[PDB]
DDB1- and CUL4-associated factor 1
Amino acid sequence: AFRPISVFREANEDESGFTCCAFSARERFLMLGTCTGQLKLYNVFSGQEEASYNCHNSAITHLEPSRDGSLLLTSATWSQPLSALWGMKSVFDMKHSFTEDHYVEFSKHSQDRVIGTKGDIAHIYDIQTGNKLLTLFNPDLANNYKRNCATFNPTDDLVLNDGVLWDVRSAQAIHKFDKFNMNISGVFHPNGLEVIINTEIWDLRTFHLLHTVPALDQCRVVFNHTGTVMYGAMLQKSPFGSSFRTFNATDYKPIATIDVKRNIFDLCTDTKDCYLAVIENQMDALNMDTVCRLYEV
Amino acid sequence: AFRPISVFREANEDESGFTCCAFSARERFLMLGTCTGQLKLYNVFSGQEEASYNCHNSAITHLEPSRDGSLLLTSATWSQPLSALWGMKVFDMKHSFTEDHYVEFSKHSQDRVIGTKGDIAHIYDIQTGNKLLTLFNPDLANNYKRNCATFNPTDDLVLNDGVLWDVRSAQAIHKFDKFNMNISGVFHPNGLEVIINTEIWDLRTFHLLHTVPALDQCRVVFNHTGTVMYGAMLQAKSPFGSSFRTFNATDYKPIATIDVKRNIFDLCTDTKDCYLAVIENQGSMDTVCRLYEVG
């Protein structure tokens, strides 16, 4: 099940402005982005604010800490730059920024690269230099997904951008997956064998259709760290509706639907896959007044 | 560093017959199984025996207290039942697992027991004692001679005989190939890796990550933060030899080799990893429990 064990808001703000979250490398701490462009560190159990940093001059949409705790990616709404890489060692400082990329992720195996998305286009950057190594766009193969989000596979040898599979080493498109929806561009399964593009599950080896899972329509997905559970939430303002769903990652069978009856902004699980944090707005309310709810998994 | 503090010896015996050890949940006592099937509780502060319970009609091989202090698993050598579950809140037998020679609790939520009978895993409900699942796929068996089935940290997966199972679907996901005759493997507490003898496998992709020669024929246990792994090599009598090794749990690099110069039967640490208890043969049998400061 998912048992709520705590809730908190942005401390001492009239309107609580949490927009996104990720568990920090430090146990007991959650990092939260806010609608005024700040990064907050909270004790997730006590709900007390620890620290605050200034990142953007507009709402943070999404963030991702590196596994080693040294780096953080943020993206914002209408700032220039739209995304940035922060050091979180001795001093919190901007290392590099990614001009017009509205979404960024780390590489997965070795976190030495950042992949950013601008519309239909992927940009790959070196963390050390900040240099743009690659621009991935093929006019013949584009799907023009409206919510495209480029991503590396588990071993960093492949990229999925706009439903197109790229060999990173050669910088060549090797396969275009056919289009079935307007918005969702897809992710790699952590098993390294399958790609999940909206409702379609494709075999990475043969490019054959393995399964159709209608409940995944218009969902963003995240796996737990052990790769046993997949969380999906349907896109809707707030990014998501009021529900998320879990699936068995090993067979795509549904486990549970959780409807919190309030718009969801983000969801994350800790490295030990014991806790879920969900940002929820206090349906389709005009007032921004979010809370972070912590669930025991 | 492991600095010896003191020894618990079996009260009123010329030779001590301890075979296994665990700290109690709240850690006021050490729980020590014996070669005649008794469970003895020793006060850690005073060193004195506070209780002795008749658990099995053969030597206790292994035991595991539940984290909440309410339950204890035991396993024994011969006869029947080979394993049992005991209530710690009057001491009594709750359930027995007649043919399972090894048992463990589930890890994330301790509502289940997993037992091993040869190549077969059995999962039981703690409350009812009912067998919920039997996991065995003859297509995939490795027939490890010292197979011990185990849950992963989230309880979503089981490793049995080197085969990875999805518990929810009760389906074998993957067979890890066989490179030794005995050791069937464990999950790393980090949730990312499987440790099967000398092979470290990626849990998600199943690719080989590392070879760790020093782990050959070892049983392992981690500190409670999962930063240190203890390993002791089975004997080709004492289950282990006279040394154990510690390893950095993140990179599998050795930290220390501890030569006890006495054969080891078991070891355990407390929740805060301040203490290590080791069952050591002083004799040759005279198996005492030596307590060490960790460190």
In short: Chain B touches chain A at residues 108, 152-154, 156-157, 166, 168-169, 171, 173, 190-192, 203-205 (CB under 8 Å).
